[PDB]
Write a protein that binds this ligand. Structure first.
Ligand SMILES: [Mg+2]
Lengths: 211, 346, 210
DNA sequence: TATAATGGGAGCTGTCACGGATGC
DNA sequence: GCATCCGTGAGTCCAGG
């Protein structure tokens, strides 16, 4: 097919098709599975060995991977890939902080405190100091990650009209504004489904604005 | 360590598009948009909801979130439900689901491919209120509009159409954020026009222009007064922490008083006024003192009509107005005598 | 704030907590049975972008083909590490090769037709069909195949072998098949009466490969 | 809204001295 | 075990401009 119909290529009579001189060649570590009936997974779905691909249950998945349903070539391609959960930034770290059972770490480090080497004793005491601070306190480690960043009351960072009518302001205003702009742009790049690289950059810049 | 060097590296990862690869990703995008339209025709579900579901499964569960235009909350439960009711289609219909998935992936790959055009375009927009990286992310919103609006059929390269929406996006951001006190887009453009006019006028006059020369070269409708007021509106705020001296002992906030909270002199004067008003009200009978304390509002904060003071005292509005008259007259006589309240009239 | 409180609790050096926090490395919360360099993915292990993209989306690579040179390998066809993908392209991984934008599309059109030849009985090798390249006849001396209809010549030439179609008035009247080892003696569009030489066959005549 | 355009630029140079966390 | 790198601190008040 082509832009305008009068340039399309139609087959005049019965024949087989051969493709010669491709522009480039793409080697992919993948698994091929042809099909003839209706196919049951779409492109984008992740599948583990033992999953139902096409033809009502006959052709199935061998490898760990992600689904590319080639309709021209009438074959499901499963590209070798795990469903690994690897994250970046404070959302990841706030997870890990939530997942820390404190008493179990207190135990690990009390055991550590018996160690012969003075180094491991020193580091386990230092760590145990933090763990027991959080324990005696009532403070959840994840609180060190901010979800809601608070806003100082306007009067303590004012927009004041000086004598001449011109405005003085505080630097905390420009800082907060930077923050709201990077947060709003992030929320909008999320809603509009933006690529990864871009959301990564917005996330990093947002960290640095809070910093 | 240097965010823009890091982002230039992440961008140099994705290699650039061959005319074929560009036209292919473009085409797949247009056809997946088409396929979402067709899939809405078939299923009778909302095309935007369809698009967000296809996008959900493309990007992954790493990101699913509530969309403001969507009339439904987009959580994994309902996207699984709708993905299932989509997989329950005939072959020639479910084929459109495969089309939309391929179109979403083409969209992400084409964006990430043209991410370097944005940098090369925003580098010419620095020193204008906004950070380099802020400028690149606005150029990225421009790249997104351009991908979703591009027609390969016109045979134009992608860069040509993208550059328009990229420039558009960067300029709208510069005009929308760079000012602490925010000024509408049309007004910012008027201010900038006035800038460039005055600059021409000075570059030909050998000196700065007056308000009048600018009101001429600006055109009709513009008088000197308007140039003046437009400038007074453009006046940006200044920092309270801008130093005055070499030493750090000196800020600019340290010279601005506080004209809102009253002074102790002011408050004490209001106290002496309240007390002397009470002292002169007590020489009135409690009825006339009460009529006045209602008709002015020194009690409860609000002043009443004559009908209210008379339906409270059980008297006619003429009578309550008349005892207000005589209360005021007795207060005027006591004041001609004692003169205890004149000093508070300022 | 050294020593990092977040970095202490989660046993992460300052360098690593910066790398995860300021988006230079991934940190794993549920490997989901992922693997890398043979070692399986342990939780809270730190991964660069190349590593995470490999594990998460899959190793792959594209290689360019200079203009005019065809592929040594076929589309869909499994390839090994080191196997040359074209006369100047050597693939660096394994799996399935894939074609990107073929320049030339060659369609092999099938044709099922009926054509006639005449041969001295002595030379013929009687067979119920004739496989491609299989000998058809062995002639002792040059033998002039002769026209058996009056008409105008349509000389259609294959790679090897030929088709002569005679057509009196547009309508075809004969289809002669000349196999390998028999030179035509006529030119396209020629007029032939009955019995004149169309082709000389010498030695052996065998079926063509096509 | 449509030729095509595809990785930025500074940096800033003459303290001094500690403590306390991090690499051969 | 020692260097080694990091951040953190480095007198008071007063005037101007
Ligand atoms: Mg005028």
């Amino acid at each position: 097919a082509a832009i305008d119909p009068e340039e399309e290529v139609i087959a005049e009579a019965e024949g087989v098709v051969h493709l010669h001189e491709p522009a480039s060649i793409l080697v992919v570590k993948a698994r091929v599975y042809p099909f003839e009936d209706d196919v049951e997974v779409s492109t984008g779905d992740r599948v583990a060995p033992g999953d139902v691909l096409a033809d009502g249950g006959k052709v199935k998945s061998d490898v760990y991977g992600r689904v590319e349903v080639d309709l021209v070539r009438n074959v499901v391609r499963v590209v070798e890939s795990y469903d690994i959960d690897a994250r970046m930034g404070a959302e990841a770290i706030q997870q890990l902080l939530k997942e820390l059972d404190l008493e179990a770490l207190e135990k690990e480090l009390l055991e550590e405190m018996k160690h012969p080497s003075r180094a491991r004793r020193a580091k386990a005491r230092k760590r145990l100091e933090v763990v027991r601070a959080f324990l005696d306190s009532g403070n959840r480690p994840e609180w060190m990650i901010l979800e809601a960043v608070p806003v100082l009351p306007p009067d303590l960072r004012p927009m004041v009209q000086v004598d001449g009518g011109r405005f003085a302001t505080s630097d905390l205003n420009d800082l907060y504004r930077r923050l709201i702009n990077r947060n709003n742009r992030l929320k909008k790049l999320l809603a509009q489904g933006a690529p990864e690289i871009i959301i990564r950059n917005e996330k990093r810049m947002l960290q640095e604005a809070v910093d | 360590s240097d965010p823009v060097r890091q982002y230039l590296h992440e961008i140099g990862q994705v290699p650039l598009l061959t005319l074929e690869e560009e036209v292919e990703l473009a085409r797949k995008v247009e056809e997946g948009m088409e396929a979402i339209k067709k899939l809405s025709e078939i299923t009778g579900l909302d095309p935007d909801l369809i698009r967000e579901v296809v996008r959900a499964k493309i990007l992954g569960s790493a990101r699913v979130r509530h969309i403001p235009g969507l009339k439904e909350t987009l959580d994994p439960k309902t996207v699984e439900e709708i993905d299932q009711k989509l997989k329950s289609l005939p072959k020639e219909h479910k084929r459109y689901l495969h089309i939309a998935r391929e179109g979403e992936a083409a969209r992400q790959h084409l964006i990430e491919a043209n991410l370097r055009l944005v940098v090369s375009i925003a580098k010419k927009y620095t020193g204008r209120g906004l950070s380099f990286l802020d400028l690149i992310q606005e150029g990225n919103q421009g790249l997104i509009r351009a991908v979703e609006k591009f027609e390969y059929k016109r045979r134009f390269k992608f860069s040509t159409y993208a550059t328009w929406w990229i420039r558009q996006a960067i300029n709208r951001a510069i005009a929308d954020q760079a000012r602490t006190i925010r000024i509408p887009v049309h007004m910012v453009e008027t201010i900038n026009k006035l800038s460039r006019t005055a600059r021409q006028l000075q570059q030909e006059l050998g000196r700065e222009p007056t308000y009048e020369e600018i009101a001429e070269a600006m055109g009709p409708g513009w008088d000197a007064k308007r140039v003046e007021e437009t400038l007074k509106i453009a006046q940006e705020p200044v920092s309270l922490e801008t130093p005055i001296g070499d030493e750090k002992d000196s800020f600019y906030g340290d010279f601005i008083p506080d004209e809102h909270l009253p002074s102790p002199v002011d408050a004490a004067t209001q106290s002496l006024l309240s007390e002397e008003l009470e002292k002169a009200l007590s020489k009135l009978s409690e009825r006339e003192a009460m009529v006045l304390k209602l008709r002015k509002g020194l009690i409860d904060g609000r002043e009443h009509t004559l009908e209210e003071v008379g339906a409270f005292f059980g008297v006619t509005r003429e009578r309550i107005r008349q005892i207000e008259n005589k209360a005021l007259r007795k207060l005027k006589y006591h004041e001609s005598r004692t003169r205890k309240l004149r000093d508070f009239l300022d | 704030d050294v020593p990092s409180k977040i970095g202490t609790l989660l046993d992460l050096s300052a360098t690593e907590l910066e790398q995860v926090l300021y988006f230079s490395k991934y940190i794993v919360l549920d490997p989901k049975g992922a693997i890398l360099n043979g070692v399986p993915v342990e939780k809270r292990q730190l991964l660069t972008d190349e590593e995470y993209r490999e594990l998460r989306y899959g190793k792959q690579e594209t290689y360019p083909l200079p203009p005019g040179v065809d592929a040594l390998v076929k589309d869909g066809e499994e390839v090994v590490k080191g196997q040359e993908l074209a006369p100047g392209v050597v693939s660096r991984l394994d799996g399935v090769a894939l074609y990107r934008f073929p320049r030339r599309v060659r369609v092999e059109y099938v044709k099922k037709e009926r054509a006639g030849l005449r041969l001295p009985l002595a030379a013929w090798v009687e067979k119920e069909a004739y496989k491609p390249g299989e000998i058809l006849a062995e002639l002792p001396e040059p033998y002039l195949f002769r026209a058996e209809e009056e008409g105008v010549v349509e000389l259609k030439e294959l790679e090897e072998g030929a088709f002569l179609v005679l057509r009196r008035e547009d309508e075809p009247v004969a289809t002669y098949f000349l196999p390998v080892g028999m030179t035509p003696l006529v030119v396209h569009g020629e007029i032939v009466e009955k019995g004149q030489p169309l082709a000389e066959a010498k030695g052996l005549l065998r079926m063509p490969r096509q």
